[PDB]
Design a protein around this ligand. Structure first.
Ligand SMILES: *[C@@](O)(c1nc2c(F)cccc2s1)[C@H](C[C@@H]1CCNC1=O)NC(=O)[C@H](CC(C)C)NC(=O)c1cc2c(OC)ccc(F)c2[nH]1
Ligand SMILES: *[C@@](O)(c1nc2c(F)cccc2s1)[C@H](C[C@@H]1CCNC1=O)NC(=O)[C@H](CC(C)C)NC(=O)c1cc2c(OC)ccc(F)c2[nH]1
Lengths: 302, 302
């Protein structure tokens, strides 16, 4: 009721769409919706192609009949293929009977989603992640994970937002939306790529402070307010992400529920940043949590 | 390498089993396997009853027609009912086509499982919990969550280990196995109930220290070793469970993968208990985490 546990969405509706896609001996995960399978285009790369592939040229050598698509051990015959940015669309001869109501959405930095981690078309586990401000995710992914998807569920409709492509040297992860456009500055090639410096997701820290208040932990409230501009300028000095107008908007329901204005909570956070945690804790921890969204708090705390 | 997240089992095989069970104005969740629906017996209760319910009496006072079972928006027909401890078994006349392979297990304290949180028969979220040494679980359960289940998945077999009954005043949770026997000293009546004192699950803290090493977080390591007995003396002083030789053996794979002997890792943990974490974090946490088992770590980190 107030465990503030990271909670994933139930994965069944996505489990019902996971397939494997093979070229030669390279097998990736794909997403089967209606009569189309979406997967990372680099399923077509050999070891020698991967360092700087010419995807257009590599694809020229591929026919429908070189792609093995399987649902478990059942083959789906490919009847068409095209490349859209960094994903392959394979048209197949069978419409997925388990296709949920779905959309493809591009998530915003700081938003969260569930990841269904899959190996050889086979679901291994589900966890919740945030899209960091530098457009990486702190996932958990082994060899074989590429094509695993991230999603949100809204009353029976699955919003697909992420497909996995890459691990960076820092151990973080990078990927695309379901139209194949990378989040952040990354490219699908076998190089060491550097992420921007990561920042704290301010909007989620504020959600967490609201959640603390809702559960009666409110020692850190002060009597002051701030302007949004002033707060944002101070936030950046502490490696906190500035608030957007969307962020202020989504804290509105939590503001209404506690009666504490968004900018009063910002002024309370501002004092915690400047004065430190005093020694004390909040909902148990001396660490401020930044991967609980306003929506997550609303969903699991009121 | 992998990264490291609190990971639940894909919940699809359990979502296909969830139904809604109503008796009077009480609605909760049931689990529909073959031609039986399992749910918490106190669906049969109205308000007065709930303080000192005589369940045998209450159950003989019901007929099959009093039980409204719904799968989606299709009423199932109840043709039979019995009671097994705190669980009600409703025989229906239609078998569940999505019934997975399953068994019913009673887990030991320290073991983890996934919880599919449900409301009105509808899956809402999934998360990973551990059975605490005081037989509570730290979940996120609200009104309407009763009948939600916990489970592990073992090679396409679902092991059901938990059904949800109660929130304690402290905000932790209590429930039964699928045989209807409570974990811990709790009772299904409408009263405020305290738990015994909790302890930290030491074998899990060690597994998580191994996960930290595998993911490149090493500051807490030291050159020392301890005996198992001396480790246990200190552990028990700090309210940590004793580590058995069986625990040592189960950490073997992670020991091998990292080249850190179990009793070396115990010396690290002893220094963390005595000296604290001195402002640093491990895998982003400022507290020692005890809700990953050795198997959880192995399965996730190779
Ligand atoms: C995928 O699972 C993919 N694996 C393959 C494959 F084996 C053959 C062809 C295509 C693909 S996609 C994998 C997921 C990684 C694996 C480790 N944890 C992960 O999340 N993605 C990769 O292996 C990608 C593949 C490119 C998109 C073509 N490469 C990297 O993630 C990668 C390469 C790197 C180098 O190269 C010199 C240096 C440092 C580095 F951090 C790095 N990362
Ligand atoms: C269930 O979902 C159930 N709800 C009902 C119900 F509304 C009517 C009849 C039967 C049931 S089972 C719910 C889950 C709880 C609700 C809050 N968060 C949860 O996880 N379980 C309960 O409400 C149980 C029911 C008993 C088993 C009979 N009761 C408690 O959890 C409960 C009762 C408490 C009191 O009673 C005076 C005091 C303090 C307290 F913390 C407490 N908890």
């Amino acid at each position: 009721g107030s465990g503030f546990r990271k909670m994933a969405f139930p994965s069944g509706k996505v489990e019902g769409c996971m397939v494997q896609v093979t070229c030669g001996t390279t097998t990736l995960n794909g997403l089967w919706l209606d009569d189309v399978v979406y997967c990372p285009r680099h399923v077509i790369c050999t070891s020698e192609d991967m360092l700087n592939p010419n995807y257009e040229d590599l694809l020229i050598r591929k026919s429908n009949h070189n792609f093995l698509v399987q649902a478990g051990n059942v083959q789906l015959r490919v009847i068409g293929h095209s490349m859209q940015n960094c994903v392959l669309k394979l048209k197949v001869d069978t419409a997925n009977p388990k296709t949920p109501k779905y959309k493809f959405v591009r998530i915003q930095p700081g938003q969260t989603f569930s990841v269904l981690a899959c190996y050889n078309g086979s679901p291994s586990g589900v966890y919740q992640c945030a899209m960091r401000p530098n457009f990486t995710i702190k996932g958990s992914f082994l060899n074989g994970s590429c094509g695993s998807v991230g999603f949100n569920i809204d009353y029976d409709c699955v919003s697909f937002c992420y497909m996995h492509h890459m691990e960076l040297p820092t151990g973080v992860h990078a990927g695309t939306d379901l139209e194949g456009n990378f989040y952040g500055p990354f490219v699908d090639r076998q190089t060491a790529q550097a992420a921007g410096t990561d920042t704290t997701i301010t909007v989620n820290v504020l959600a967490w402070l609201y959640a603390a208040v809702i559960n009666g932990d409110r020692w850190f409230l002060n009597r002051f307010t701030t302007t949004l501009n002033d707060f944002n300028l101070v936030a950046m000095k502490y490696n906190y992400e500035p608030l957007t107008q969307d962020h202020v908007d989504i804290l509105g329901p939590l503001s209404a529920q506690t009666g504490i204005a968004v900018l009063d909570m910002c002024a309370s956070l501002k004092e915690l940043l400047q004065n430190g945690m005093n020694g004390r804790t909040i909902l148990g921890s001396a660490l401020l949590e930044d991967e609980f969204t306003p929506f997550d708090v609303v969903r699991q705390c009121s």
